[PDB]
Amino acid sequence: IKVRENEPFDVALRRFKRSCEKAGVLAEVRRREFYEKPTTERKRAKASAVK
Amino acid sequence: EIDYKDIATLKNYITESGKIVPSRITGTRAKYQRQLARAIKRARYLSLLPYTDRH
Amino acid sequence: SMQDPIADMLTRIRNGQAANKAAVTMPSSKLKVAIANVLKEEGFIEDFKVEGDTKPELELTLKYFQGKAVVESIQRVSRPGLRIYKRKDELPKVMAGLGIAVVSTSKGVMTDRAARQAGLGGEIICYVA
Amino acid sequence: SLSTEATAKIVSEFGRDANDTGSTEVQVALLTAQINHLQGHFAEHKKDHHSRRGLLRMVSQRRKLLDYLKRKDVARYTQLIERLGLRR
Amino acid sequence: MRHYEIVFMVHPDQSEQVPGMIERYTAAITGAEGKIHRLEDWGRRQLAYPINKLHKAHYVLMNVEAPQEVIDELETTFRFNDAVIRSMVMRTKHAVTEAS
RNA sequence: GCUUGAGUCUCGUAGAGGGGGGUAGAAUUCCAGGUGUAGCGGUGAAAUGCGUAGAGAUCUGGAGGAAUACCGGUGGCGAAGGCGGCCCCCUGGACGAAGACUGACGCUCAGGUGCGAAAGCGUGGGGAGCAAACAGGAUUAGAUACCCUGGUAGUCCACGCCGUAAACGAUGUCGACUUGGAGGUUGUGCCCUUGAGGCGUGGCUUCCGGAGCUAACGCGUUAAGUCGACCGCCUGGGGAGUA
Ligand SMILES: [Mg+2]
Ligand SMILES: [Mg+2]
Ligand SMILES: [Mg+2]
Ligand SMILES: [Mg+2]
Ligand SMILES: [Mg+2]
Ligand SMILES: [Mg+2]
Ligand SMILES: [Mg+2]
Ligand SMILES: [Mg+2]
Ligand SMILES: [Mg+2]
Ligand SMILES: [Mg+2]
Ligand SMILES: [Mg+2]
Ligand SMILES: [Mg+2]
Ligand SMILES: [Mg+2]
Ligand SMILES: [Mg+2]
C-alpha cells in the first residue's frame, strides 16, 4: 500500500500493489452483487484447488 | 492468541495494511486461527491495533 | 428399531459370509439358540457358542466348502410386519428338497423335513440353502 | 440450563436419595422445573422460535414419561401431578 | 458468580476522574460481595487510530468477579459517562492476574 | 423381573444454532466549508445526465441508512428454511470423559400442530446503495429488451398476514450388518510433555475406491450394498397440478 523507498532508485518498486488491493477486492466489488453464487464460484476455487 | 492484550505476539499475524493473514500463510492451526482473529478484532476495537494503514 | 432380531441374525450371517468371515457374534436369546441349532444340526455352520450370563452372546462358526460359503442364501420369511403360518400339508420345501426352511412348531424349532415328519405345522421362521 | 444447585435440590425432593437421579418422578419434575422457568424467557422475545423447539421437546418428553409412570404406579403418578401442579 | 475482563478508556482531559472512577466501580462491585481479581491503571497510552478525534487516551484494565447485575449498571454508566470513550466487558472463565 | 435400546445426573469442549440490547470501523450518498479550475461521467462508440450558481478532483467537519473486507476454509452450526464485525444478557441442541440413577419408558406416524428462502399483502416507521414499474438516451429492420442517465414500489425495523422455491443430496425416519486409502474438523486416554510431537479411542465432514448394487451415469461403512419397522408417494405423454 505504502512505499518509503529512500535514496538510490527511480524504479517504482511497488509490487506490493499486486499483493492485495487493485483487481483484488476491487475487481470483486466493482459489479454484480453476487449473494450466493460466490458459493458456487468458490466451490470451483476448491473443486480445482484439490488437484 | 491466548489474549488480545498481547499486541506483541499479535502484530505478527497481520499485513502492513492491518488485514488479518490467511491461515495458509501462517500455517496456524484451525482452532487457533479463530482465537487469533477474535483477539485481533478485540485489539482493533480497543484502538490497540489499526483496522487500516490509513491510520 | 431392533424390532426383528432374527433377521439381524440371518443377515449377520449372510454378510459375514459374503465377507469370508470366520466368526460372528450378536446378542443371544432362546429363539436365536434354537435356530443356531438347526443351522448346525443341518450343517450350514461349524458350531455355535453362547458366552456370558448377564448379557448372553451367541457366537457362530461359519462353514466354507470350496472357495464359496456353505450358506448360498439365508432369507427371513415370517417377520413382525407380516407373520406366516403354514399347516402341515402346506409347509414349504426349499430348493426342491436341497436346503431347508426353519419352522417353529408347538413342539420346538425344527426343519420342514422334521415338521413334516412330526406331522404338524408352525411359523416358517426363514429359508436357508 | 437450570442451576446445579436447583437441579440437585429437586432430585433430592422427588426421588429416593440424591443419586436416584433418573427416577421417573424426578425427570418429570426436573423438566417441569425447566419448562416453567422458560415461560418468562418466551414471554419476552417470543420470536425465539428455535429455542422454543427445545421447550416443546421438554414437554413431549415429560408427557411421555408421565404416561409411562401412570401405566406403572398410578399412585406415584397422581401424587406427582398434585405435587407439581399440572393436568388441572 | 461470573468473572469478566473489562477495560475502558477515559478521555485525556477527564484523566483526573480515573482515580475516583476506579474507587467507585470497586466499592460498587465489592459492595455486592464480588471479588476484584485484577486492576491496572495503564494511564495515558497512544492510540492505533484517532478516535473521537484526539490521539492517546487513559486505559484501565480490571478483571472482576461479580453478579450479572452490577455488571449491567457498569455498562450503562459507561454510557451516561461521556468521559469514557470506549469500554468492553468481556469473557469470564475464572479469574486472572498480572498478564499485560 | 433384566440392562445392552432409550432416558436422567456430574464435569467439560467446539460452534455465523436461536432471541434481545449495546457498539465499531471502511465505504457509499448527502449537508457545510478550504484549495482548485473546465470539464466530469458514461459507452463498444455515443447520447441523455452533471459542472462557470464552480462540477469532478483534493482536504476537513458533520448527518443518515445499509451491509459487515481481512480472518474465511470442499471450515463450522441448525430439523428444514437458513445462520458471518465486535461485546453483554436470555436460550436450544450437539459432543466427549468417568462412573451413578431409571429399567424397554422405544421406533415410526394418517389425522393434528408448529416452523418455513425470496417475492407479495396490511398499519406505522425508516430509506444510503441497489432496483421491478415507469421516464429519458442508444442499439436495432423493428427493440415494449439486453446497454446508458434517472428512478417508484420493494430491499430496512416493529407488529401481523401469505405457506410457496430446482424448499435438492432432485436420495423419508430409525435401527443392525458388510474390505480399504488420503485428508479437513472437533472431543478425550496414554507417552524421557524433554519436538513444532508418539501411539491410541469417539462425534462430524471432504476426496478416492473394493465387493456388492445400477439401464447406464454412478453409489460405495455419511450406500444407491445386506437386512428389518413404520410413513409419504408413482402407475404413458398431453390435458392439469387444471375444472
Ligand atoms: Mg422376540
Ligand atoms: Mg464516512
Ligand atoms: Mg468528508
Ligand atoms: Mg449450549
Ligand atoms: Mg407458519
Ligand atoms: Mg419478506
Ligand atoms: Mg411493507
Ligand atoms: Mg437501470
Ligand atoms: Mg411444491
Ligand atoms: Mg441444494
Ligand atoms: Mg474409509
Ligand atoms: Mg466413490
Ligand atoms: Mg438402506
Ligand atoms: Mg389450483
XYZ file of C-alpha atoms (C1' of nucleotides) and ligand atoms in Angstrom:
680
model
C 0.000 0.000 0.000
C 2.738 2.368 1.101
C 6.355 2.605 -0.058
C 9.085 4.746 1.508
C 11.911 3.877 -0.903
C 14.508 6.437 0.212
C 17.565 7.378 -1.875
C 19.009 5.375 -4.793
C 16.375 4.114 -7.298
C 13.763 5.824 -9.522
C 12.154 2.455 -10.263
C 8.675 2.314 -8.689
C 9.329 -0.865 -6.710
C 5.640 -1.071 -5.742
C 4.828 -4.698 -6.429
C 3.058 -4.590 -3.079
C 0.006 -3.456 -5.083
C -0.058 -6.904 -6.604
C -0.230 -8.270 -3.054
C -3.752 -7.145 -2.046
C -5.874 -4.241 -3.438
C -6.162 -3.486 -7.172
C -8.008 -6.157 -9.208
C -8.096 -7.964 -5.861
C -11.008 -6.741 -3.771
C -11.566 -4.016 -6.417
C -12.460 -6.205 -9.388
C -14.513 -8.096 -6.792
C -16.715 -5.233 -5.509
C -16.797 -3.484 -8.942
C -20.051 -5.123 -10.045
C -22.773 -7.748 -9.834
C -23.577 -8.094 -6.192
C -23.331 -11.976 -6.302
C -25.032 -13.057 -2.995
C -24.916 -16.876 -3.383
C -23.131 -17.834 -6.494
C -19.838 -16.851 -4.916
C -20.629 -20.045 -3.036
C -20.640 -21.751 -6.432
C -17.710 -19.615 -7.625
C -15.554 -20.626 -4.624
C -16.762 -24.222 -4.938
C -14.564 -24.206 -8.051
C -11.739 -22.453 -6.222
C -11.655 -25.769 -4.322
C -13.023 -28.260 -6.882
C -9.901 -27.074 -8.696
C -7.606 -26.459 -5.706
C -7.932 -30.119 -4.649
C -5.742 -31.015 -7.645
C -3.984 -15.869 20.624
C -4.125 -16.550 24.361
C -5.178 -12.879 24.525
C -5.855 -9.640 22.639
C -3.652 -7.685 25.093
C -0.715 -9.483 23.520
C -0.389 -6.838 20.780
C 3.177 -8.214 20.796
C 2.620 -11.793 19.594
C -0.362 -10.373 17.704
C 1.365 -7.846 15.423
C 2.990 -10.738 13.502
C -0.340 -12.031 12.184
C -1.383 -9.043 10.066
C -0.053 -7.300 6.970
C 1.305 -3.755 6.743
C -2.290 -2.912 5.807
C -3.557 -4.352 9.076
C -5.501 -7.153 7.380
C -5.613 -10.497 9.150
C -3.302 -13.025 7.477
C -4.738 -16.226 5.983
C -4.037 -19.435 7.872
C -2.482 -20.840 4.690
C 0.409 -18.406 5.193
C 0.810 -18.540 8.941
C 0.424 -22.332 8.913
C -1.601 -21.681 12.046
C -3.854 -24.471 13.330
C -7.639 -24.130 12.899
C -8.945 -23.714 16.422
C -6.270 -21.064 16.954
C -6.734 -19.025 13.748
C -10.158 -18.262 15.215
C -8.839 -17.495 18.707
C -6.380 -15.283 16.849
C -8.835 -13.307 14.770
C -11.248 -12.923 17.678
C -8.354 -11.369 19.622
C -7.138 -9.177 16.723
C -10.701 -7.949 16.370
C -10.767 -7.228 20.056
C -7.436 -5.396 19.727
C -8.894 -3.383 16.840
C -11.977 -2.284 18.749
C -9.849 -1.210 21.689
C -7.690 1.067 19.495
C -4.855 -1.410 20.314
C -4.319 -2.073 16.613
C -5.362 -0.411 13.352
C -8.151 -1.718 11.101
C -6.361 0.277 8.498
C -2.959 1.634 7.470
C -4.935 4.811 6.752
C -4.006 5.439 10.394
C -35.872 -50.302 15.810
C -34.042 -53.585 16.656
C -37.529 -54.918 16.151
C -36.545 -58.071 14.324
C -33.587 -59.893 15.937
C -33.897 -62.990 13.754
C -33.410 -61.012 10.528
C -30.378 -59.435 12.226
C -29.050 -62.939 12.666
C -29.995 -64.248 9.231
C -28.171 -61.200 7.948
C -25.142 -61.018 10.285
C -24.518 -64.455 8.848
C -25.378 -63.559 5.233
C -22.999 -60.603 5.321
C -20.197 -62.076 7.381
C -20.324 -64.967 4.944
C -20.088 -62.845 1.793
C -17.173 -61.235 3.677
C -15.493 -64.648 4.034
C -15.550 -64.006 7.757
C -14.929 -66.986 10.054
C -16.679 -65.869 13.250
C -19.849 -63.939 14.057
C -21.379 -62.650 17.272
C -24.600 -60.920 18.408
C -26.847 -60.768 21.453
C -28.392 -64.201 22.055
C -31.815 -65.472 23.067
C -33.558 -68.821 23.487
C -35.009 -68.286 19.987
C -31.622 -67.433 18.449
C -30.144 -70.566 20.002
C -32.848 -72.999 18.812
C -32.085 -71.799 15.287
C -28.278 -71.848 15.524
C -29.023 -75.446 16.469
C -30.900 -76.348 13.302
C -28.216 -74.492 11.338
C -25.503 -76.664 12.903
C -27.585 -79.836 13.051
C -28.485 -79.473 9.384
C -24.907 -78.362 8.767
C -24.732 -74.809 7.460
C -22.290 -73.743 10.153
C -19.481 -75.401 12.120
C -20.857 -74.801 15.628
C -22.319 -72.132 17.912
C -21.428 -70.845 21.398
C -23.010 -68.543 23.970
C -20.511 -66.652 26.160
C -21.883 -64.684 29.113
C -24.505 -64.605 31.874
C -25.652 -61.003 32.435
C -25.670 -60.199 28.729
C -25.561 -63.547 26.811
C -23.878 -63.566 23.405
C -24.449 -66.000 20.547
C -21.318 -66.914 18.633
C -21.397 -68.824 15.334
C -18.700 -70.542 13.317
C -19.162 -70.209 9.587
C -18.540 -73.118 7.240
C -16.869 -72.628 3.876
C -16.630 -75.527 1.452
C -14.757 -74.725 -1.747
C -13.899 -71.062 -2.256
C -17.621 -70.455 -1.744
C -19.553 -70.296 1.527
C -21.900 -73.055 2.571
C -24.867 -70.727 3.013
C -25.902 -69.744 -0.517
C -28.962 -67.819 0.680
C -30.407 -67.016 4.100
C -33.745 -65.185 3.965
C -36.376 -64.194 6.544
C -39.842 -65.428 5.660
C -42.066 -64.513 8.549
C -41.492 -61.182 10.297
C -43.122 -58.617 12.613
C -44.891 -56.702 9.842
C -46.325 -59.803 8.203
C -46.307 -63.142 10.032
C -46.596 -66.512 8.321
C -48.226 -69.786 9.345
C -48.473 -72.879 7.197
C -50.277 -76.001 8.376
C -48.567 -79.377 7.900
C -49.754 -80.196 4.401
C -48.819 -76.679 3.330
C -45.310 -76.486 4.759
C -42.824 -75.244 2.139
C -39.895 -77.248 0.754
C -36.894 -75.098 -0.250
C -34.782 -75.829 -3.355
C -36.976 -78.846 -4.211
C -35.612 -80.576 -1.088
C -31.990 -79.393 -1.109
C -31.552 -76.776 1.578
C -34.305 -76.203 4.128
C -36.835 -73.999 5.889
C -36.660 -73.352 9.630
C -40.092 -73.528 11.233
C -41.302 -73.190 14.815
C -43.957 -75.647 15.933
C -45.679 -76.231 19.256
C -43.020 -78.880 19.770
C -39.978 -76.681 19.159
C -37.977 -75.111 16.340
C -37.446 -77.696 13.587
C -36.892 -78.052 9.860
C -39.566 -78.611 7.238
C -38.126 -82.114 6.772
C -38.758 -82.502 10.511
C -42.161 -80.822 10.958
C -43.498 -82.844 8.025
C -42.327 -85.996 9.853
C -43.611 -84.595 13.145
C -46.912 -84.368 11.245
C -47.606 -80.816 12.424
C -47.206 -77.137 11.403
C -45.891 -73.795 12.627
C -44.491 -70.376 11.768
C -41.972 -70.626 8.972
C -39.161 -68.566 10.533
C -36.880 -68.466 7.475
C -35.394 -70.193 4.418
C -31.810 -71.495 4.091
C -29.963 -73.071 1.180
C -29.677 -24.610 31.893
C -31.079 -24.891 35.434
C -28.531 -24.476 38.257
C -26.611 -27.465 39.625
C -27.884 -26.129 42.907
C -31.598 -26.233 41.986
C -31.288 -29.337 39.788
C -29.797 -31.204 42.719
C -32.393 -29.869 45.134
C -35.178 -31.427 43.065
C -33.552 -34.808 42.696
C -33.344 -34.628 46.493
C -37.026 -33.578 46.635
C -38.569 -36.241 44.401
C -36.573 -39.475 44.168
C -35.047 -41.578 46.932
C -31.565 -40.352 47.932
C -29.616 -37.976 45.739
C -28.109 -40.271 43.060
C -31.570 -41.690 42.353
C -31.204 -39.153 39.560
C -33.105 -40.956 36.785
C -36.181 -41.805 38.830
C -39.240 -41.341 36.637
C -40.755 -38.922 39.177
C -37.529 -36.928 39.221
C -37.094 -36.390 35.496
C -40.710 -35.203 35.263
C -40.080 -32.609 37.996
C -36.667 -31.749 36.567
C -38.296 -30.991 33.259
C -41.388 -29.372 34.770
C -38.988 -27.078 36.585
C -37.192 -26.014 33.419
C -40.347 -25.752 31.341
C -41.974 -23.355 33.790
C -38.794 -21.273 34.110
C -38.724 -20.951 30.348
C -42.180 -19.290 30.171
C -40.669 -15.925 31.079
C -37.929 -16.416 28.511
C -40.533 -16.848 25.770
C -42.759 -14.146 27.315
C -40.177 -11.581 26.314
C -38.729 -12.400 22.872
C -41.482 -14.801 21.597
C -39.716 -14.758 18.216
C -37.094 -17.166 19.659
C -38.538 -19.947 17.548
C -35.523 -22.231 17.692
C -35.177 -22.417 21.458
C -38.934 -22.937 21.543
C -38.371 -26.284 19.800
C -36.262 -27.408 22.742
C -39.065 -26.449 25.100
C -41.744 -28.299 23.179
C -39.344 -31.232 23.186
C -39.119 -30.904 27.003
C -42.888 -31.346 27.096
C -43.128 -34.210 24.586
C -40.624 -35.873 26.872
C -42.315 -35.265 30.215
C -45.666 -36.127 28.620
C -44.218 -39.473 27.569
C -42.546 -40.193 30.904
C -45.731 -39.202 32.697
C -47.766 -41.597 30.567
C -45.295 -44.377 31.395
C -45.464 -43.874 35.165
C -49.282 -43.840 35.083
C -49.163 -47.301 33.475
C -46.730 -48.411 36.187
C -47.786 -46.884 39.521
C -50.844 -44.667 39.124
C -50.351 -43.888 42.802
C -46.898 -42.470 42.165
C -48.471 -40.746 39.183
C -51.337 -38.993 40.965
C -49.056 -37.890 43.812
C -46.731 -36.470 41.187
C -49.087 -34.148 39.305
C -50.703 -32.919 42.526
C -47.179 -32.279 43.709
C -46.024 -30.442 40.570
C -49.382 -28.868 39.760
C -50.455 -29.864 36.259
C -53.340 -31.591 34.427
C -55.843 -29.196 36.103
C -20.646 -15.544 40.317
C -19.312 -14.669 36.870
C -15.915 -13.154 36.080
C -15.345 -10.541 33.357
C -12.211 -8.958 31.891
C -13.486 -5.379 31.432
C -11.476 -2.428 30.179
C -12.429 1.152 29.464
C -10.735 4.237 28.076
C -11.175 7.653 29.634
C -10.847 10.944 27.726
C -7.468 12.657 28.469
C -8.914 15.916 29.869
C -11.045 13.748 32.185
C -7.977 11.745 33.251
C -8.082 13.017 36.812
C -11.501 11.443 37.355
C -9.983 7.998 36.686
C -8.800 7.510 40.280
C -12.264 8.208 41.683
C -13.818 6.123 38.921
C -11.898 3.012 39.919
C -12.507 3.798 43.577
C -16.219 3.983 42.665
C -16.598 0.915 40.426
C -14.700 -1.078 43.059
C -16.842 0.000 46.005
C -19.730 -0.752 43.639
C -18.626 -4.352 42.976
C -17.133 -5.216 46.356
C -20.350 -3.649 47.626
C -22.259 -6.718 46.439
C -19.564 -9.021 47.799
C -17.805 -9.506 44.480
C -14.054 -10.018 44.243
C -11.644 -7.858 42.241
C -9.013 -10.145 40.743
C -7.011 -7.535 38.818
C -6.544 -3.820 38.207
C -4.100 -1.905 36.016
C -4.095 1.868 35.568
C -2.401 1.778 32.141
C -2.539 5.591 32.133
C -2.227 7.721 29.005
C -1.401 5.393 26.105
C -1.176 6.297 22.404
C -3.965 5.084 20.087
C -3.696 2.913 16.969
C -6.060 5.226 15.033
C -7.534 8.521 16.139
C -10.967 8.174 17.754
C -13.411 10.994 18.558
C -10.566 12.983 17.079
C -7.750 13.271 19.642
C -4.975 10.650 19.949
C -3.756 8.900 23.081
C -6.135 8.008 25.916
C -6.160 6.774 29.508
C -6.638 2.994 29.829
C -7.874 0.806 32.686
C -7.737 -2.988 32.694
C -9.684 -4.669 35.509
C -10.717 -8.311 35.994
C -13.587 -8.855 38.376
C -15.948 -11.412 39.835
C -19.455 -10.056 40.350
C -23.160 -10.771 39.729
C -24.712 -10.176 36.319
C -26.385 -7.044 37.669
C -23.635 -4.781 38.947
C -22.055 -5.669 35.619
C -25.136 -4.208 33.931
C -25.188 -0.830 35.669
C -21.499 -0.620 34.899
C -22.106 -0.973 31.177
C -24.713 1.784 31.251
C -22.794 4.252 33.434
C -20.103 3.880 30.748
C -22.760 5.496 28.509
C -24.147 8.065 30.970
C -20.468 8.921 31.211
C -19.165 10.973 28.277
C -15.592 10.956 29.640
C -15.297 7.224 28.797
C -14.832 6.987 25.037
C -14.738 3.155 24.907
C -15.352 0.180 27.121
C -15.739 -3.540 26.706
C -16.712 -6.082 29.360
C -15.598 -9.489 28.181
C -15.493 -13.260 28.545
C -15.057 -14.649 32.076
C -13.746 -18.253 32.622
C -12.192 -17.881 36.111
C -10.038 -15.053 37.440
C -6.661 -13.865 36.114
C -3.611 -11.992 37.469
C -0.571 -9.984 36.257
C -0.506 -10.559 32.426
C -0.405 -7.473 30.109
C -38.155 -59.000 36.830
C -33.039 -57.901 33.434
C -29.732 -53.862 31.284
C -27.342 -53.638 26.343
C -32.253 -49.945 23.462
C -33.930 -45.160 25.498
C -33.811 -41.683 29.285
C -31.919 -38.693 33.722
C -27.305 -36.849 36.744
C -21.655 -34.720 37.174
C -17.772 -32.269 34.624
C -16.028 -30.047 30.389
C -15.488 -28.776 24.692
C -16.362 -26.719 19.963
C -19.634 -23.845 17.308
C -22.337 -17.495 11.552
C -27.690 -22.537 16.315
C -31.896 -19.237 18.153
C -33.976 -14.177 20.769
C -32.770 -9.219 22.900
C -29.726 -4.862 23.933
C -25.262 -2.188 23.012
C -21.235 -0.869 19.906
C -17.071 -0.384 15.863
C -14.581 0.658 11.584
C -14.219 1.011 5.962
C -17.225 2.669 2.084
C -21.026 4.941 -0.296
C -24.774 9.092 -0.706
C -25.849 13.651 1.231
C -25.048 18.883 4.042
C -21.451 22.774 5.269
C -16.620 24.751 4.284
C -10.772 25.233 2.466
C -7.998 24.930 -2.100
C -8.524 24.304 -7.109
C -10.436 25.048 -12.485
C -13.377 23.371 -17.090
C -14.589 19.696 -17.560
C -16.735 15.268 -15.147
C -19.478 10.961 -16.036
C -20.795 7.074 -19.328
C -20.165 3.623 -23.697
C -18.412 -0.966 -27.904
C -18.995 4.060 -29.837
C -22.485 7.570 -28.050
C -26.053 10.438 -26.318
C -29.476 11.762 -22.256
C -27.232 13.389 -17.491
C -23.879 16.617 -14.256
C -20.395 21.368 -13.982
C -18.700 28.690 -14.610
C -24.927 29.474 -9.140
C -17.629 26.363 -9.742
C -18.687 20.456 -11.036
C -15.465 16.406 -10.979
C -10.528 16.168 -8.406
C -8.367 17.039 -3.257
C -8.721 18.292 2.292
C -11.637 18.974 6.537
C -16.102 18.813 9.898
C -20.925 16.676 10.001
C -25.651 13.762 9.136
C -28.006 9.355 7.838
C -29.065 4.365 6.261
C -27.226 -0.398 4.701
C -24.048 -4.264 4.945
C -20.073 -6.247 7.966
C -13.324 -6.540 3.968
C -9.151 -9.365 6.030
C -9.973 -13.924 9.156
C -12.830 -17.243 5.543
C -11.542 -22.610 4.656
C -14.958 -28.849 -0.184
C -14.292 -24.500 7.828
C -18.416 -24.588 11.349
C -23.914 -24.626 13.468
C -29.304 -25.902 12.866
C -34.837 -30.195 11.709
C -35.543 -27.689 7.062
C -35.711 -22.833 5.835
C -31.279 -20.851 6.767
C -27.321 -18.759 10.242
C -20.763 -14.376 9.109
C -17.765 -7.159 12.600
C -17.321 -6.974 17.886
C -19.380 -7.147 23.134
C -23.076 -8.391 27.160
C -27.867 -10.666 28.618
C -31.501 -14.840 27.624
C -31.649 -19.551 25.476
C -31.952 -24.561 22.136
C -29.401 -28.563 20.536
C -24.799 -31.462 19.788
C -20.420 -33.915 21.545
C -16.827 -36.159 24.834
C -14.756 -38.321 29.815
C -15.810 -41.008 34.413
C -18.927 -43.567 36.880
C -24.115 -43.248 39.262
C -29.628 -43.400 38.875
C -34.316 -45.002 35.791
C -35.475 -50.153 33.881
C -37.949 -51.094 27.367
C -40.043 -45.568 29.467
C -38.661 -47.463 22.221
C -39.119 -46.765 16.632
C -42.380 -44.799 13.097
C -46.669 -41.916 12.382
C -52.562 -40.955 8.517
C -55.216 -37.109 11.069
C -53.491 -32.696 14.016
C -49.939 -28.881 15.299
C -45.644 -25.886 14.732
C -41.807 -23.975 11.670
C -40.891 -22.449 6.971
C -35.934 -18.505 1.423
C -37.467 -14.577 -1.828
C -41.193 -12.163 -3.810
C -46.025 -10.497 -2.303
C -50.221 -8.028 1.193
C -51.986 -4.630 5.886
C -50.605 -0.374 9.611
C -46.912 2.916 11.159
C -41.960 3.987 10.790
C -37.298 4.092 8.007
C -34.886 4.952 3.214
C -27.746 5.449 1.948
C -26.992 1.925 -2.090
C -29.480 -1.169 -5.140
C -33.872 -1.802 -8.162
C -39.349 -4.429 -10.871
C -42.655 -0.277 -12.646
C -42.200 3.950 -15.219
C -39.214 8.279 -17.972
C -35.306 9.666 -20.954
C -30.783 8.300 -24.023
C -28.733 4.464 -27.527
C -28.753 -0.195 -30.365
C -31.653 -2.492 -33.965
C -35.352 -3.964 -39.848
C -38.127 -3.464 -35.812
C -36.056 -3.272 -29.590
C -42.329 -2.659 -25.359
C -35.325 -5.693 -24.402
C -30.192 -6.683 -23.329
C -26.569 -1.115 -22.846
C -26.584 4.115 -20.662
C -28.782 8.532 -17.475
C -32.579 8.851 -13.996
C -35.838 6.327 -10.788
C -41.099 4.456 -7.582
C -42.689 0.269 -5.101
C -39.536 -3.066 -2.645
C -34.961 -4.211 -0.451
C -34.579 -1.950 6.264
C -37.467 -2.032 11.717
C -41.800 -3.293 14.585
C -46.485 -5.910 14.591
C -49.438 -9.244 11.765
C -50.517 -11.823 7.064
C -49.048 -15.238 2.989
C -47.135 -21.013 3.329
C -44.653 -21.349 -1.622
C -38.902 -22.402 -4.406
C -34.588 -26.771 -8.893
C -37.820 -25.645 -0.262
C -32.253 -30.637 -3.969
C -28.101 -34.840 -1.723
C -33.957 -33.836 -7.038
C -31.806 -39.721 -2.194
C -38.169 -40.111 4.228
C -37.233 -41.594 9.573
C -34.925 -45.154 12.774
C -32.083 -49.473 13.769
C -28.357 -53.674 12.783
C -24.701 -55.704 9.477
C -20.539 -55.522 5.400
C -12.565 -54.832 2.632
C -9.557 -50.194 2.111
C -6.725 -45.376 1.088
C -5.589 -39.871 1.691
C -7.422 -35.530 4.102
C -10.319 -31.442 6.820
C -12.802 -30.740 11.665
C -13.692 -31.360 16.676
C -13.517 -34.197 21.863
C -10.844 -37.430 25.063
C -6.689 -41.657 27.352
C -1.577 -42.654 27.418
C 3.949 -41.239 26.251
C 12.004 -39.026 28.683
C 5.147 -33.225 27.701
C 12.090 -33.247 27.067
C 9.564 -31.553 19.353
C 6.813 -27.881 16.382
C 5.061 -34.498 18.759
C 4.418 -40.618 19.502
C 0.688 -44.302 19.603
C -4.462 -44.827 20.574
C -10.105 -44.123 21.258
C -15.013 -41.077 19.952
C -18.637 -37.297 17.079
C -18.699 -34.718 12.173
C -17.027 -33.894 7.412
C -14.335 -33.750 2.159
C -11.946 -36.960 -1.958
C -10.916 -41.548 -3.931
C -12.002 -46.530 -4.249
C -13.476 -52.898 -3.117
C -17.049 -56.198 -3.129
C -21.875 -55.541 -3.881
C -25.706 -52.655 -6.403
C -27.150 -49.807 -11.148
C -30.355 -49.115 -17.602
C -26.106 -46.774 -17.549
C -24.128 -42.418 -15.093
C -22.733 -43.611 -10.848
C -23.283 -45.054 -5.326
C -19.925 -47.440 -2.371
C -19.282 -48.106 6.146
C -22.235 -40.374 5.688
C -24.791 -46.777 0.336
C -27.868 -46.050 -4.379
C -24.679 -52.713 -0.565
C -27.111 -56.642 3.019
C -31.425 -56.630 6.037
C -35.883 -55.169 9.344
C -40.019 -51.323 11.407
C -43.190 -47.584 10.143
C -44.730 -43.372 6.983
C -45.165 -40.428 2.222
C -45.671 -41.213 -2.948
C -45.752 -43.404 -8.537
C -48.704 -46.208 -12.329
C -47.858 -43.479 -20.663
C -47.428 -38.251 -22.810
C -50.516 -34.018 -23.350
C -54.993 -32.203 -20.944
C -53.543 -30.464 -15.368
C -51.423 -29.672 -10.510
C -56.125 -27.609 -14.493
C -62.154 -27.646 -13.680
Mg -38.872 -61.727 20.396
Mg -17.627 8.095 6.279
Mg -15.907 14.043 4.415
Mg -25.424 -24.583 24.878
Mg -46.303 -20.569 9.807
Mg -40.329 -10.667 3.128
Mg -44.477 -3.372 3.825
Mg -31.345 0.834 -14.726
Mg -44.500 -27.957 -4.445
Mg -29.039 -27.558 -2.742
Mg -12.762 -45.193 4.576
Mg -16.776 -43.168 -4.735
Mg -30.684 -48.676 3.164
Mg -55.323 -24.874 -8.139
